[PDB]
Amino acid sequence: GYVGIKIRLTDVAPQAQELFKKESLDVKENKVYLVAATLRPETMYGQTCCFVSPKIDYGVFDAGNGDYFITTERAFKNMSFQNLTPKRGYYKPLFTINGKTLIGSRIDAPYAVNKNLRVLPMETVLATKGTGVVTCVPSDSPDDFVTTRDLANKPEYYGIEKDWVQTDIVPIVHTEKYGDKCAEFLVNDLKIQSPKDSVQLANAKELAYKEGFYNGTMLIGKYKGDKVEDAKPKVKQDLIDEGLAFVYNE
Template sequence: MEGRKVYLAAATLRPETMYGQTNCWALPDGIYGAFEINDTDVFILTARAALNLAYQHLSRVPEKPTCLCELSGYDLIGLALKSPLAFSETLYALPMLTVLTDKGTGIVTSVPSDSPDDFMALQDLVTKPALRVKYGVKDEWVLPHKVVPINPHS
């Protein structure tokens, strides 16, 4: 994929929350692929999502996704990412066991301030060193994210 722009293609129904994005989630046992969108862009997502995009003219070959290589969710964990709307300069792909690969793209943006599922999954990684070890998650990928409490009396 050298010389191409590679995107971890996350789907969201709430783009207005992307300012609070702390990471992306992938299903560790999920099957993903690197699919050609055109001559320069490659999206990493599930084959089902790539097929749906191909029918929307987002495939180098119309209506036929072209997979350059297959990847597992484990391959994605730890990827350093840049999200155009996030405050953090670098985000990481982290494991989440409840990601559905038959919805969206199988890659999920994480905004713990707006999603209880995201909050709990991130807290599990923060508070359970054994979980980080199991999935090869480095401390610096999760420990800097502190919850900002909101005081209802101010």
């Protein structure tokens, strides 16, 4: 039970341009989407980039009616068994593309208040989970906060431009326990120092989940002031209704 978020690829990285030209895929007259898997549609207001893994070969899949999806082959195969693709049981990529080739691309992300978003590398993406595409919400995701900090602190080391990473976080969800940027609060509190502190990050993630859902209040968007508990399914429905998202199961 994930929510897939359709993140429009508006200009592809130079190293990806040769490849897209070759298969006659125009990201301007076609709707090419990176599809992020989330459990938190209510956080979409606070996207600051979209993550892919340097270590994953993604497929570019014909998603029907002029849409194309960039996910792992695993996730598009699953989608083809729940009427989310043109033909049931068909999941041949038009071609494959490695995560690194996409780094630096420009994107539009549904509901994001920040503008000029980029695709950025996340080494800690689990290839077998969701779509392998992970959207970045530094205010409320411990993992996203830790990776962002690490990208901004060592940008030359990661092969990225500093301009690409947003560090000014606009608060999205108010909690009474961890303030207005619960991911920051918890990363500081648990003193998590690397994207690879898996156990501690799982702990932080779990604590942020419970608090955000039961005690979180929206600070932005249509349902500002509302409890996350009440607002979340509405935001999710709006996104689906506007064609910006869809549900899909594992």
